[PDB]
Enzyme design. Structure first.
Site, PDB file in Angstrom:
ATOM      1  N   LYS A   1       0.788  -1.149   0.076  1.00  0.00           N
ATOM      2  CA  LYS A   1       0.008   0.109   0.062  1.00  0.00           C
ATOM      3  C   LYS A   1       0.826   1.164   0.046  1.00  0.00           C
ATOM      4  CE  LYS A   1      -3.747  -2.150   2.629  1.00  0.00           C
ATOM      5  NZ  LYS A   1      -4.811  -2.115   1.553  1.00  0.00           N
TER       6      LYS A   1
ATOM      7  N   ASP B   1      -1.813   3.529   7.383  1.00  0.00           N
ATOM      8  CA  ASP B   1      -1.720   3.749   8.779  1.00  0.00           C
ATOM      9  C   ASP B   1      -2.852   3.377   9.424  1.00  0.00           C
ATOM     10  OD1 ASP B   1      -2.686   5.899   7.356  1.00  0.00           O
ATOM     11  OD2 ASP B   1      -2.694   7.147   8.954  1.00  0.00           O
TER      12      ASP B   1
ATOM     13  N   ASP C   1      -8.737  -3.884   9.709  1.00  0.00           N
ATOM     14  CA  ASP C   1      -8.909  -4.799   8.686  1.00  0.00           C
ATOM     15  C   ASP C   1      -9.365  -6.244   9.480  1.00  0.00           C
ATOM     16  OD1 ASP C   1      -9.658  -4.707   6.060  1.00  0.00           O
ATOM     17  OD2 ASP C   1      -7.721  -5.226   5.188  1.00  0.00           O
TER      18      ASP C   1
ATOM     19  N   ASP D   1      -2.717  -7.635  -2.033  1.00  0.00           N
ATOM     20  CA  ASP D   1      -3.482  -6.730  -1.043  1.00  0.00           C
ATOM     21  C   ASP D   1      -4.896  -7.086  -1.140  1.00  0.00           C
ATOM     22  OD1 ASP D   1      -3.999  -4.618   0.540  1.00  0.00           O
ATOM     23  OD2 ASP D   1      -3.917  -2.865  -0.925  1.00  0.00           O
TER      24      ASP D   1
ATOM     25  N   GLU E   1      -6.125 -10.009   0.048  1.00  0.00           N
ATOM     26  CA  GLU E   1      -5.914 -11.174   0.540  1.00  0.00           C
ATOM     27  C   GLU E   1      -7.127 -11.608   1.620  1.00  0.00           C
ATOM     28  OE1 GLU E   1      -5.032  -8.266   1.602  1.00  0.00           O
ATOM     29  OE2 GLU E   1      -6.283  -8.302   3.626  1.00  0.00           O
TER      30      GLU E   1
ATOM     31  N   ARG F   1     -10.243 -11.943   0.709  1.00  0.00           N
ATOM     32  CA  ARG F   1     -11.181 -12.930   0.091  1.00  0.00           C
ATOM     33  C   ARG F   1     -10.404 -14.412   0.155  1.00  0.00           C
ATOM     34  NH1 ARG F   1     -11.179 -10.334  -5.543  1.00  0.00           N
ATOM     35  NH2 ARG F   1     -11.165  -8.501  -4.494  1.00  0.00           N
TER      36      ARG F   1
END
Ligand SMILES: CC(C)(C)CC(=O)N[C@@H](C(=O)NO)c1ccc(-c2cc(F)c(F)c(F)c2)cc1
Ligand SMILES: CC(C)(C)CC(=O)N[C@@H](C(=O)NO)c1ccc(-c2cc(F)c(F)c(F)c2)cc1
Ligand SMILES: CC(C)(C)CC(=O)N[C@@H](C(=O)NO)c1ccc(-c2cc(F)c(F)c(F)c2)cc1
Ligand SMILES: [Zn+2]
Ligand SMILES: [Zn+2]
Ligand SMILES: [Zn+2]
Ligand SMILES: [Zn+2]
Ligand SMILES: [Zn+2]
Ligand SMILES: [Zn+2]
Lengths: 519, 516, 514
Positions: free
Chosen positions: C297, C305, C310, C370, C372, C374
C-alpha cells in the site's frame, strides 16, 4: 470605472460589498472594573484564568453591584468549574430587582500572557455563545491581563468572527440572524483602553473588507470589477486614484505584467491609490499587492493532485490586504506620510492568446525574462509593479503576495514569511507584526541560488529548475527589479486562507496599517 | 440552426442513416407445428439440452425435407453439443437437389436464458452472418422464450448485425452484404408476430441513439445535435422547440449557461413533445444529459485513465431520450403526454469558461458554488429539472452519464437508479425487466447532505467519495414536489469490448412510457 | 492461550480489554412524560423540535415541578433559541430548594421522523455536554417521537459515544443515574438492558479494532477470543498452523506466510439448551494488519496507517458473540468463525502470481497480494459449510470500492439467497445499522477465469471490485444459503478518529429475531 465584459447576461458585473455591517451599529461602552459590574439585560461573560494551576477552579474577583449575583458567583459555588482554555459555562439567575439575568465565563488557561492564538481561541469560544442566542447586549468582564494592543486585537477578532458573510446566500439565509446592539467592557484602567475601541472597529472592517474581496468568487471578482471597487473605495475616502488600462501599460512597456493577462477576457487594470497627509510629508511608502483574481496556472495548468485550483480565487489576497489598508489609512488619516497603494490586477487563464512556457518577455526595466513556468505568474506581475513603484520615488517598497505554496511547508498556516534587501525595513515589519498580532517570520534571501536563474538566452530565468526553495528563489527574482530602494516582500500564500473555517483571514491589513502608523 | 466553423472543412451536420439495411429485411414468422422448409440461405436451430451440461444436440422440429431430416437425425447430431455460444455449419443437398446451409447455436442447459445469455447466443449467430454473403436467414426456435425475450432477440440481432460506416471513406468494407429475408419458426407464432415490428422500432431507436453517440464531437456539437432533434421531430410530427441563449437568459438558467460559456457553440435546449389524441392520464418529462464533449473544463481530464478521448459519450443520456422519442412517436401510445428534454452544451477550456470556485445561480434561485468544473453534468441537469417541474408533470425521469464512480459500484452492465419516490422507482425497475435493460436501485443517503453545505452559496456543487449518491442529493434539491427518478448510465453506456455505444436506455424509457 | 512472539522485550503480549465500564454503573429510570418532570438534580435536557418552522424557535411543552426552572423554561426565554439539528444550550441555576441544577436542550430539527443519522447528531450534541459535566445525573426528556427501536438505538449510541477508550494513555465525571421521560414509558423499559448489552458488544469490538497491530496480532486476538468464550461459557477452539495444514487451508495460510505471528483460526460456539431448530455460522475477516503484501500500500490514499482496522469483521463477530452468550436466545446454534492472520512483506511472503490451493481443492492464481481477505474468507467459508449450517453470513472490510459506491454510512450486502438477504435487511432496520442490497452480477464471472489455475483471485479489468470479490467468494459455498456484508467503507469513523463497532448489533438482531 470600466464596464465588465460578460459571456452571458447572467454574468455578474460587480462585486457586492457590505460597508454598513451590523458591527458598526454596535454601541461599545468601556467601564472601569473598580466601580463594580452591573449585571442587567443580555449576557455577562467573565474572562477568567488561574495562573500556574492548569485547569484550576474559577474565581470571580470583580465587585458585582448586585447582592443576588454576588452570592451566585461566590467562590464555593464556582469551584466546580475550571479555567481550561476554551471552556465556557452559562448561568441563569434573578438579580436584586427581581429580573432574570444570564451570566457566564470563558476559561483563559493558566498562563498569564495569552498569545494571539490563545486569545483567538477565547474569542471563538465567546462567539459560540453569541450564535443561536438572540441577545440584545453582551458584557465582557476582563479578569485577565492584556496590554493595549492585545485588547484591540480581542475586539477586532470578536468583530470579525462574529460577522457572517451572506452576500451569496439566496434561498439559504439564516432566519435567526440577529446581532447584539450593545457591547459592554469591564477592564482595569479603562481610560487607557478606550482609545483602542474605534481603532479596532476601523481595523476590523479593513480586514473584513479585504475578506469580502477575497471570498468573492472569480466570476464576481475579476480584474475589471476589482479595479472598479478600488475606485468606489477611494471615492468614499477621498484617496487619489489612477486605474491604468492596457494601452497605458503598453506605453510603459510592462511586458511581464501584460503577458500574464494576455489569455484573459478581462483587460488588465493597474490600481494606483494615493494617500497623502495634509502636513509636510516626511515619508513616502509604496504598498504593493499581488492581484491574480484567478490562477488556473496557465498552460502549466493546476492539474496535479492537491493543486487546489478551486481555492485559487484567493490569489488577490495581497491586493485585498493592500486595499483593506487603504481603508484603515484613509480613515484614521496619519500625518507626515504619503502612501501609494499599488496592484497589477489580472487573470492567469488558458487560451489561444495565453503566454506560453518558454516565452521570452521584456519587463519595463528592460530586462528580458524567459518563462519556465506559467504558474509562477505572480513574480512576473510583481516585477513590473516593483519597477513602477520605484519610479514614484519612495523610501519603502513593501509587497504582499500569495506567491509560493512552499510557505505551507516552511512556516505553515499561521506565520507569514518576510524577505528583503534592507534589515531596518525588515525589523519594522517584525515590529509591526508584534503590535498588530499578525505573525510574520524573517526568512533569508540566499544569494548562492541566484546562479540558477541564469538563462542561456534571456537576461534572467523566471524560475529555477534545480532548486526547490521556491520562496527564496522568487525573492531573488523580485530583488532583481528593485535597483536602489529599501524593499521587503511578504509571502502570505500559506496564511491567507482559514482552512478549518473555510473563509479568508484578511491577513496583512492590520500588519500593513501598523506599519504606516508607527512610522 | 447554423453550425459555426473554425475552418471550412469542419462538418456542419451529423451524418445520420435512417433507412438502414435492416429496414429492407422482409421478416416472416411461421408456426413450428407445420414444420420448417429448408431451401435457401442459412437455417439455424436454437437448441438446448435441459439438465445435461454440454449435452448432445437434438433437432426436435419437424423438417419438411427427407434429405435434410436424414442429415439432422440424432445419430448424426450426437457429436455436437449445446454449450452456450457454440455454433456449427452444415452443408447438404435438399430434396430439390439444391445445396443448402444448415446450422445451430447452442443455448446451454438452463431452461431460462437470461439477458446476458441471449446476447451471447445472438453474437454467435451474428458471427455466422459476417463474412458469409447470404441472401436469407431463417431461425428455428427450439427453446422456450417469452414475448419480451423473443423481441429482445430481434432487437439485438438487428443491432449487432448492422455496421456503422458513416465515417468510413477509403476503408469501406468491400464484402459487406446484408440478408434480404428473415424467416422465424416458433411455437404459438401468432402471439409473436406483433413483436416483430416493435423490435424494428426498438432497434432503430437504439441505433439512432447509437449513431448520435458514436458521432464525434467535431460532428456532434450542440448546434448540430439540436438540428438533428428538430429533423427527428419534423419526421415524427412531434411538437418541438429549441431554446437558445437569450431565451435561456430570460429563464435565468445560470447553471446550465455557465457550463457552456467556454464553448464556441451556443447552448441549445431541446424540447420535444408527444401528446396523445384524447384524454391524457399521465404527463411525463424525460431529461437527458447532453454534453457533446466533456473536456473537464479548467478541471481538465488530464489524470491517467481519465479517458478524455471517449468523452463524446457524455451525450448518451440525450441520445437515449431522442431514441425514445422516435419509438414513442412511431408507436404512438395513448393517454400520455411526453416531454423530451435535454440541455445540450459543450464543456471546454477557454478565456470565457466557468472556473472552479464560481458561484452561479440556478433558475430556481439557488446559488451554487462550483467546486469542480468536471462535475458540469449536474449543473445542466439542475436547470433542466427545474424547467421540467414547471411543466406540471407527474413523473420526471432523468438519464445521464453522470459519475465515473458507477464503474466501481455496478460496473459496465447494470445502470443505477436513484429517486425520491418508491412507486416511480419500481416502475423503472419493472421496465428494466421488460426492456431487458439491467437497472439496480441505489439509495439516496440523506446523511451525506451536510457535505454539500456551502459557506457562501446556498449549496455546494460537489462534496469536497460516494459520487453517484452525492450527485443525486444535489439533483434532489431542484425537484420540489414531483415524483422524480435518476438513471446513472456512466458505466454502461459504452461497450469497450466492441468499441461502440450501446444506445442504453432507449428501450428502457420506451417500456416505461408504453406500459404506464 | 498461545505465547505471543516478540522482537524486543518491550513488545506487548496481550490486548488490554476493559470489561467493567462506568456505563455499567449507570442506573436508568424511565418515567412517563404525561405525569410531568422532576428537575431537582443534575443535568436535564429536553429533546425538542419545530415541525412547523425550519430552524423555528424552541418551545418546551412539559410541565416541570420546580418554580425556578418553570420560569427559565417559559416561551419568552426559550424562543431566543432554535431547534436546528444538533444545536444545544444549557444553563446552570438553583432550583426551589437552592440546589445546583443544569437545564438545557438539543434541537431535533423540523422533521417529526428522526433517522438514525439524525439521532446520532442529537446524541453527539448530548455527549459534548456530558464531557463537560461533573453532575451525578442526566435526565433526558423526550418531547419528540421515537419508536422502541430508535429509542434503544439512542441508548446504545449514548453509551458508546459517552465511553472513552484510554487503555493507551499514560474535566468530567461519569454519571451514576440516567432519567428518561417518554410517552408510554412502560413499553420502553425493556429496551434499556438490551441497549446495555448491545453497547458493550459494540464497544468490545471497538476495543479490538482500535487496538494497534503491535498489540492486536493473530496470537493475542485469538487469546482474547478464548478469554471471552470462557467468561460466557461458550465452547471454543483455536486451530493452529499444524491443524490448518492438515485441513489444507492453503489460501488462508498463504496470506499469513510472511508474518512473524502464526495463523490462528477462531471457532466459538453458542448452543441453546432446548431443541436446536436453526444453525448459523457467522464469519469475520480477521486481518490484524494489512500492509498490502508485495503489492504494498504505497499509492496516495491507500492509508496504510489505518490498516489495523481490517479485522473489523472479526471484532464484530466477537462483539455479537458477547451479546448472544449474554442474552441466551433459544432454539439456535451459532458458530463464530474467523481465520486470523497478518499480511506482511517478508522473504517468506506469498508473491503476486503464486498459484495456491484451497481446502476445497480449487487452485487460485494470485494477482494482487493486497486482496488477501477474500483468500482467507475462502477457506473460512469452506470450513463454515462443513458444519452443516442453514445460514452463512460473512462480514468483512473487503473492497475500497465501497467508499465510491455506498460511502461511509451504508454497508453493502451480497448473497446467493434472497430470503437470507431479506432477513439481513430486516435486521438492518431493527438495529439501525444501515445496509443496502447490491447485486452479484453473473456476467462478470468470466473475468475470474484463470489461464492456469481453476480461478483468478481478482479481475484484471473490471473495476466493480465489490461485485467481483463476491463472485469469487461464491465459488466456495456449494449449496448453503449465504450472505456477504462488505463493511470496508463503514467500519471506521473518520470524523471522530475511532471505530464504529459496526455489525455487532446487526448480527445480534439477525440471530435473535430469526
Ligand atoms: C513555484 C511553483 C510555481 C513551481 C509552485 C508554486 O509555488 N505555485 C504557487 C502559485 O501558483 N503561485 O501563483 C502556489 C501558491 C499557493 C499554492 C497553494 C496551494 C494550496 F493547496 C493551498 F492550500 C495554499 F494555501 C496555497 C500552491 C501553489
Ligand atoms: C465527480 C467527479 C467530477 C470528481 C468525477 C466524475 O464522476 N466525473 C464524471 C464526469 O466528468 N461527469 O460529467 C465522469 C463520468 C464518467 C466517467 C467515465 C470514465 C471512464 F473512464 C469510463 F470508461 C466511463 F464509462 C465513464 C468519468 C468521469
Ligand atoms: C481490489 C484491490 C486489492 C485492487 C483494491 C481493494 O479493494 N483493496 C482492499 C484491501 O486491501 N482489502 O484487503 C481495500 C479495502 C479497503 C480500503 C479502504 C481504503 C480507505 F482509504 C478507507 F478509508 C477504507 F475504509 C478502506 C482499501 C483497500
Ligand atoms: Zn500560479
Ligand atoms: Zn499566483
Ligand atoms: Zn465532466
Ligand atoms: Zn459530464
Ligand atoms: Zn488487502
Ligand atoms: Zn485486507
Amino acid at each position: 470605472a470600466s464596464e465588465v465584459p460578460q459571456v452571458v447576461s447572467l454574468d455578474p458585473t460587480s462585486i457586492p460589498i457590505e460597508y454598513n455591517t451590523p458591527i458598526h451599529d454596535i454601541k461599545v461602552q468601556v467601564y472601569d472594573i473598580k466601580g463594580g459590574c452591573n449585571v442587567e439585560e443580555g449576557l455577562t461573560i467573565f474572562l477568567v484564568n488561574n495562573p500556574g494551576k492548569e485547569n484550576g477552579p474559577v474565581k470571580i474577583s470583580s465587585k458585582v453591584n448586585d447582592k443576588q449575583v454576588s452570592e451566585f458567583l461566590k467562590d464555593e459555588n464556582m469551584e466546580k468549574f475550571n479555567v481550561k482554555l476554551g471552556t465556557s459555562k452559562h448561568f441563569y439567575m434573578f438579580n436584586d430587582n427581581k429580573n432574570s439575568v444570564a451570566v457566564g465565563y470563558v476559561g483563559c488557561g493558566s498562563v498569564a500572557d495569552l498569545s494571539e492564538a490563545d486569545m483567538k481561541r477565547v474569542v471563538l469560544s465567546l462567539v459560540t455563545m453569541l450564535h443561536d442566542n438572540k441577545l440584545s447586549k453582551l458584557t465582557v468582564v476582563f479578569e485577565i491581563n492584556v496590554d493595549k494592543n492585545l485588547f484591540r486585537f480581542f475586539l477586532e477578532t470578536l468583530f470579525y468572527e462574529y460577522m457572517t458573510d451572506e452576500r451569496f446566500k439566496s434561498t439559504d439565509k439564516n432566519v435567526n440572524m440577529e446581532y447584539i446592539k450593545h457591547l459592554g467592557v469591564y477592564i482595569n484602567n479603562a481610560d487607557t483602553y478606550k482609545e483602542e475601541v474605534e481603532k479596532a472597529r476601523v481595523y476590523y472592517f479593513g480586514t473584513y473588507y479585504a475578506s469580502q474581496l477575497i471570498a468573492a468568487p472569480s466570476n464576481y471578482c475579476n480584474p475589471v470589477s476589482l479595479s472598479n471597487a478600488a475606485v468606489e473605495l477611494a471615492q468614499k475616502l477621498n484617496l487619489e486614484y489612477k486605474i491604468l488600462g492596457v494601452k497605458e501599460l503598453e506605453e510603459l512597456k510592462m511586458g511581464a505584467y501584460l503577458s500574464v493577462g494576455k489569455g484573459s477576457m478581462y483587460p488588465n487594470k493597474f490600481i494606483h491609490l494615493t494617500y497623502k497627509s495634509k502636513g509636510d510629508v516626511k515619508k513616502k511608502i509604496a504598498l504593493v499587492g499581488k492581484g491574480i483574481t484567478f490562477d488556473s496556472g496557465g498552460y502549466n495548468l493546476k492539474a496535479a493532485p492537491g493543486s487546489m485550483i478551486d481555492l485559487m480565487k484567493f490569489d488577490m489576497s495581497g491586493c485585498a490586504a493592500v486595499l483593506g489598508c487603504a481603508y484603515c489609512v484613509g480613515t484614521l488619516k496619519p500625518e507626515n506620510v504619503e502612501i501609494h497603494f499599488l496592484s497589477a490586477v489580472c487573470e492567469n487563464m488558458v487560451s489561444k492568446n495565453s503566454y506560453r512556457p518558454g516565452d521570452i518577455i521584456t519587463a519595463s526595466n528592460g530586462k528580458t525574462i524567459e518563462v519556465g513556468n506559467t504558474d509562477a505568474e505572480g513574480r512576473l506581475t510583481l516585477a513590473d509593479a516593483l519597477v513602477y513603484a520605484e519610479k514614484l520615488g519612495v523610501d519603502y517598497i513593501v509587497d504582499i503576495a500569495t506567491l509560493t505554496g512552499a510557505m505551507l511547508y516552511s512556516l505553515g498556516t499561521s506565520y507569514a514569511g518576510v524577505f528583503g534587501n534592507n534589515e531596518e525595513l525588515i525589523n519594522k515589519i517584525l515590529q509591526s507584526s508584534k503590535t498588530s498580532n499578525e505573525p510574520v517570520w524573517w526568512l533569508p534571501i540566499i544569494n548562492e541560488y541566484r546562479a540558477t536563474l541564469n538563462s542561456k538566452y534571456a537576461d534572467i530565468n523566471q524560475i529555477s529548475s534545480s532548486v526547490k526553495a521556491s520562496s527564496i528563489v522568487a525573492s531573488l527574482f523580485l530583488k532583481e527589479f528593485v535597483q536602489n530602494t529599501a524593499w521587503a516582500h511578504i509571502d502570505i500564500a500559506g496564511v491567507s486562507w482559514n482552512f478549518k473555517a473555510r473563509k479568508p483571514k484578511g491577513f496583512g491589513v492590520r500588519l500593513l496599517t501598523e506599519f504606516v502608523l508607527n512610522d
